[PDB]
Amino acid sequence: VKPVTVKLVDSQATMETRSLFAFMQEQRRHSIMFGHQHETTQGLTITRTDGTQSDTFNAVGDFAAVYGWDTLSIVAPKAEGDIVAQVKKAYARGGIITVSSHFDNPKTDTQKGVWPVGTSWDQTPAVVDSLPGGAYNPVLNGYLDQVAEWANNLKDEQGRLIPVIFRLYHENTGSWFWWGDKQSTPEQYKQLFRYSVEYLRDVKGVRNFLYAYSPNNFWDVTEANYLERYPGDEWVDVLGFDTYGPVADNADWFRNVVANAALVARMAEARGKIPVISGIGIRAPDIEAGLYDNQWYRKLISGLKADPDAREIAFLLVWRNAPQGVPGGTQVPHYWVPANRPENINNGTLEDFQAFYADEFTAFNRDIEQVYQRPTLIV
């Protein structure tokens, strides 16, 4: 592997972090990596949550290449539990780590009791009041302090920092989160993102992050629409989006997936970024109703890879496999990787996912190599 020049948001990022960026720049035009939230910490078929098992592995015999987790595992009260050990195991396997940010609401987080009050899903606008000068800026800062302390101590067995793709304030073109589009002007959102990156990088000294931006899919798929709340090329390494679609009659939605992926791919080439799909799935209500699409993964890979732009995404990530679903009283299913168990055998979804795995263009953990020791230069 010969040296390549990289330009990161953090001009002082570690060599392994720079290498990860270089890796994806190359890899992305040869495969699409499979990602999974809570890959080794949540599953329907795992017997340990210590980082050694996954539903993916039990289904196809390899782990996801990209391992997603969240600030819900970092910032107090760490509702999703610590992940340091499991991150380290993933990295030691040569996996890639990404962490999203379901931050509590800085304006209302003392008021927790009746969900969703005080959480990401508390729609009370908190952007204006959380920027410097705002009354709740110290509360936001406390979250960021905890993210920085975690990152700054996230080290492998040799004492070297583990790179993370840190994704901030996602799905911001909708209004279900407190940083969303009813909660901020575009400028206020951009300031929230830039303030936060600067705080982590410059105030707290984080050196092992790449920064990802990911709005929702657009139905009017234009660069100008993506740019409206885009933080800017100085603030983003990874151009993503999230999209959740219907379980049935979904051809239009799949064309829209491909169109958004093509857009971010073209923008990423022009801007020196990595394009990804940071979160994609059948919408949770459909899965919770017991519904399924047993061609979903086959439609996904075939649509993406046929398109000359969309195929250039580095990875796509699907959400967590909740071991006991979510409350429906009863529990209802809440998972995205088909499990190796009677329900998914019988409904054809396990077969679908195994075909996705077998596809030449998908890459799972053993399919990626030389991720972190690639030589790089910076200007």
Ligand X SMILES: OC[C@H]1O[C@@H](O[C@H]2[C@H](O)[C@H](O)[C@@H](O)O[C@@H]2CO)[C@@H](O)[C@@H](O)[C@@H]1O
Contact partner at residue 70 from ligand X, Na ion, none, CB < 5 to 8 Å by partner kind: ligand X
> Does residue 28 touch Na ion according to CB under 5 A?
yes
Interface stretch with ligand X, choices 16-24, 122-130, 250-258, 318-326 (CB under 6 A): 318-326
Rounded-to-integer distance, Cα 178 and Cα 323, Å: 28
10, 39, 55, 70: residue in contact with ligand X (rule CB under 6 A): 70
User: In terms of C-beta density within 10 A (0-12 exposed, 13-18 middle, 19 or more buried), how is residue 272 classed?
Assistant: middle
59/274 with CB nearer Na ion: 274
291 binds ligand X (CB under 6 A): no
The region of 140-148, 207-215, 257-265, 313-321 touching Na ion under the rule CB under 5 A is 313-321
- Interaction between residue 104 and ligand X (CB under 6 A): no
Q: Is 379 helix (H, G, I), strand (E, B) or coil?
A: coil
- Cβ(56)–Cβ(335) under 8 Å? no
- Listed in sequence order, the DSSP H helices in 64-200 are 84-92, 137-152, 186-198
CB of 171 to ligand X, least distance (A): 6
Interaction between residue 204 and Na ion (CB under 5 A): no
User: Residue 112, interface with ligand X (CB under 6 A)?
Assistant: no
Which residue's CB is nearer to ligand X, number 297 or number 319? Answer: 319
Name the one range near ligand X by CB under 6 A: 103-111, 156-164, 209-217, 319-327: 319-327
Sign of the alpha-carbon dihedral angle for 277, 322, 42, 166: positive
Q: Which is nearer to ligand X, 248 or 326 (CB)?
A: 326
* Contact in structure between 196 and 167 (CB atoms under 8 Å): no
Give the up-direction half-sphere exposure of residue 53: CA atoms within 13 A in the CB hemisphere: 15
The tokens for 194 are 């830039």
Rounded Cα distance between 181 and 138, Å, is: 23
| Bond prior to 125 in cis (omega within 30° of 0) | no
Shortest reach from residue 371's CB to Na ion, in Å: 15
Cis peptide before 77 (omega within 30 of 0): yes
**Based on CB atoms, which residue is closest to Na ion, 28 or 167?**
28
How far is Cα 294 from Cα 348, in angstroms, rounded to an integer? 5
Interface with ligand X (CB under 6 A), residue from 118, 279, 303, 333: 279
Beta-carbon count within 10 A of 108 CB: 19
Alpha carbons 200 and 367: distance in angstroms, whole number: 32
Tell the burial category of 30 from Cβ atoms under 10 Å away from its Cβ (0-12, 13-18, 19+).
exposed
Number of residues that bind ligand X (CB under 6 A): 11
32 binds, among Na ion, ligand X, none (CB under 5 to 8 A by kind): Na ion
118 binds, among ligand X, Na ion, none (CB under 5 to 8 A by kind): none
* Minimum CB distance to ligand X smaller for 94 or for 116: 116
Residue from 103, 195, 315, 319 binding ligand X (CB under 6 A): 319
Q: Which of residues 212-251 bind ligand X (CB under 6 A)?
A: 242, 244
Point out which residues bind ligand X (CB under 6 A): 70, 72, 102, 171, 242, 244, 279, 284, 319-320, 326
